[PDB]
Amino acid sequence: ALWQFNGMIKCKIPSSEPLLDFNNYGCYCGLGGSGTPVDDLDRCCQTHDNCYKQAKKLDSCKVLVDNPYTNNYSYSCSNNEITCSSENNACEAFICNCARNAAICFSKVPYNKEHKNLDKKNC
Ligand SMILES: [Ca+2]
C-alpha cells in the first residue's frame, strides 16, 4: 500500500525520502499519469501505474474489493533486498510485486531533476 511502497523504495535507495523525491516527477510519478514518459524513471512510474491498474481487474482482488493504498501486504528488507511475503494472498502478492518491481526500477535509472515538478502540458 502507500507506506509499504515508501519503505520498499528506501530499502533500495537508503538516502531517499520517496514521498518527497519521487512524487511529482515527470508525467507518471505521482497522481495520475498520461502522455509519453520523459525518461526511464518516468517509465518505471508508468509501468507501476499500469500494474496497479491491472491489479484492480484481478479476480482475487475483485472477489474482495481492495484499494492499492488500503492493501496491507507484507514484505521485508534485508541487505537492500526486498522480499514480498510468501504469506501474501494472490491479490496482495500481485500488488507487492508491482511495488518491488517499481522500487528496483527506481534504483536502476538516472534521476533528472529538470523533470521534477513538470508542467503537465509536456505530457
Ligand atoms: Ca502515477
UniProtKB/Swiss-Prot annotation:
Disulfide bond annotation, renumbered to this chain: 11-77, 27-123, 29-45, 44-105, 51-98, 61-91, 84-96
A cellular component annotation (GO) from this entry: extracellular space
Gene Ontology biological-process entries: antibacterial humoral response; antimicrobial humoral immune response mediated by antimicrobial peptide; arachidonate secretion; defense response to Gram-positive bacterium; fatty acid biosynthetic process; innate immune response in mucosa; lipid catabolic process; phosphatidylcholine metabolic process
UniProt modification remark: Activated by trypsin cleavage in the duodenum. Can also be activated by thrombin or autocatalytically.
Localization per record: Secreted
UniProt EC number: 3.1.1.4
Active site as annotated: 48, 99
Catalytic function, reaction form: a 1,2-diacyl-sn-glycero-3-phosphocholine + H2O = a 1-acyl-sn-glycero-3-phosphocholine + a fatty acid + H(+); 1,2-ditetradecanoyl-sn-glycero-3-phosphocholine + H2O = 1-tetradecanoyl-sn-glycero-3-phosphocholine + tetradecanoate + H(+); 1,2-dihexadecanoyl-sn-glycero-3-phosphocholine + H2O = 1-hexadecanoyl-sn-glycero-3-phosphocholine + hexadecanoate + H(+); 1-hexadecanoyl-2-(9Z-octadecenoyl)-sn-glycero-3-phosphocholine + H2O = 1-hexadecanoyl-sn-glycero-3-phosphocholine + (9Z)-octadecenoate + H(+)
Keyword Mitochondrion included in the entry's annotation: no
GO molecular function, one term: signaling receptor binding
Keyword 4Fe-4S: no
Cofactor: Ca(2+)
Residues the entry annotates as binding Ca(2+): 28, 30, 32, 49
Cofactor binding summary note: Binds 1 Ca(2+) ion per subunit.
Group of enzyme by EC: hydrolase
Alphabetical keyword list: Autocatalytic cleavage, Calcium, Disulfide bond, Hydrolase, Lipid metabolism, Metal-binding, Phospholipid metabolism, Pyrrolidone carboxylic acid, Secreted, Signal, Zymogen
Role, per record: Secretory calcium-dependent phospholipase A2 that primarily targets dietary phospholipids in the intestinal tract. Hydrolyzes the ester bond of the fatty acyl group attached at sn-2 position of phospholipids (phospholipase A2 activity) with preference for phosphatidylethanolamines and phosphatidylglycerols over phosphatidylcholines. May play a role in the biosynthesis of N-acyl ethanolamines that regulate energy metabolism and inflammation in the intestinal tract.
Family: Belongs to the phospholipase A2 family.
Subunit relationships: Monomer or homodimer.
This protein's name: Phospholipase A2
Shown stretch of the complete protein: 23 to 145 of 145
